[model samples]
Target: AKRIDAALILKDGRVVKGSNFENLRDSGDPVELGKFYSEIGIDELSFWDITASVEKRKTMLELVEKVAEQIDIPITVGGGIYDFETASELILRGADKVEINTAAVENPSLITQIAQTFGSQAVVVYIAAKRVDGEFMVFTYSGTKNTGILLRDWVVEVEKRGAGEIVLGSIDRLGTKSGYDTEMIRFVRPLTTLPIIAHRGAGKTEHFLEAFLAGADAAKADSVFHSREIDVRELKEYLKKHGVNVRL
Candidate 1:
């Protein structure tokens, strides 16, 4: 059995961890992300299968379910989630939460509908953004499509629509870890009360500190966590010592 070290288990049995390739298979393979977490002794895991939006028209329920089965921790699926029906179906199939991006941008009301059907806690909206024209606009569709929706506006709208949490990914800063887009962080934090998960751009332990200092509720790492540049347990301690709020 795979031993889980430090992690949080969600109500829906979903586990959260960091991943390098949002699309596990796109950049590498499925087990790669899972194994990376396991090696780091981080039991909770989040597996984002991001290719479905283009490779498939709808969320890949079976694939998500399979990953759910194999891992010792909970798994949350993102990409290809657009509406209530899809979110409901995914949850029914055992997904902890349906991560919404593109469709949420196209139909801001979908979040409300999904929350109404499955409860807000089951909805996790991912806002992958880049600093464009001096503002952060959310990106979607496997990280290749850009929505031009202001980061703060998108966060507020989704929260109003009953979204339980927000996952912000700094697209331009993603693999580079030049540091999180602080402007986007400040922009969304004040406008919305939903718990925010800051994604992308955590290349170093100090960078993670920058995220919390900027007001992010939870911060995710890609290359760093995947490559063992910073251990998640040490991360929680670092946050605690620095007086940054954390579940641990």
Candidate 2:
């Protein structure tokens, strides 16, 4: 099994995580946190400017560059990137990959455009979704709009458009610490060959283990790690014991 990647959300230059994608609080500095995670043997990092798309502004470029300079591990940056120019600028600024959530859904062609310019490996499509009436529905602009797109359909589309990875965000479980939406993760697994990052609802080490077993390529937990409720190294150790491959 491959190592699960870690992703953190940055709201207005500060780290923040919300329950069900709301009620966020200050966490810490991104650059320092980035350095901390990398030093602890975290294999990968993803930084997102949570409100950039809704605010119609670009992600904090200077912040991404600063964080990138501090971390040795591969990093993916996203938020409010609606054009190829912004995406390329982020890559040039040191982001190893760029993730698209709102923009990708708003303009599907942008996915193909970025993949063509930066290679498919550089494009990470984030699906912020929730179960509505027993069907997984896609949301954009930070889960404010349920785009009427199905999880199954979007995953396949993004893969065909050249997205190298998919951040399978369960908005309902986000920051809830309940557990992963393993059900949805399992449902989408066969829809595409892209690696899926199980986003949200990870409160313990077993959460990661269960998600990985359920077909998640990686599991991202912010509050648990940010609040120091769980140590990344210890979590990896626990996963290793549970038969999940992780760097110790």
Candidate 3:
């Protein structure tokens, strides 16, 4: 098994924090924040053009390259990545991996195409899900609309389609600081062996451990780290103390 990874999210062109994928508040400069996290040993960084999905445009590539230039760790770029050319452009610009949400939900064949063309490790499928009627329903367009795709089934399909990893986001728990939706992670863990990166709702170090215990391969957070409520090093130390293998 690989060590559990810690990731920080950058929204739009700036580092922003939000709850439920809405009401975004600016946190800092993406370049500066990226440098900070890279220096402090964050396993990876995710930069998202939060509006790209709804706006039907590609992510800010220049900003992504700027961050990538300053950081040595892997950088995952997402938002408005709808086709193979877009994914290739980001990778050429310095992104180590490309994540697709809205486009993948709309056309899953895109996932297979990109994975086949770029290799599975270069492609990630971002699933934003909201709890509806006691089941997690996948949402697209930046969590603004539901796709009626159930989480369990979606996970299996994405894995079969050639996605290297899955970023399972809980829209209801996002930015809520209530802790990760581990129950959802636990439920989906049995569906695929692809690394599941738990996104949103992480309020503290224990939350990361909880996610790992629930079978998440990584934990993605925004508010807590961006707001300085928790430090990356401190969280890794806590994880190590608790027996979760994390790079310290």
Writing each residue's lDDT as its tens digit, candidate 3 over 97-175 gives: 9999888888899989888877999999999998999999999887889888898889999999999999999998965
Q: How well does candidate 1 match the true structure in TM-score terms?
A: 0.77
Ordered from best to worst TM-score, the candidate numbers read 2, 3, 1
Clashes of each: 2, 0, 0
Q: Choose the strongest candidate by TM-score.
A: 2
- Tens digits of per-residue lDDT, candidate 1, 30-128, equal 545565565545644555553423434343666566656766655566656667777788788877777788888888788888888779988888888
Order of candidates by lDDT, top first?
2, 3, 1
Q: List the candidate 3 regions with Cα displacement exceeding 4 Å.
A: 1-12, 17-27, 51-59
Q: Which run of 10 residues does model 3 get worst, by summed lDDT? A: 18-27
TM-score of each: 0.77, 0.90, 0.89
* Clash count in backbone of candidate 1: 2
Q: After superposition, how far is residue 172 of candidate 3 from its true place, in Å?
A: 2.1
Off by over 4 Å in 2: 17-27, 51-59
Best by lDDT: 2
Instruction: Write down the lDDT that model 2 would get.
Output: 0.82
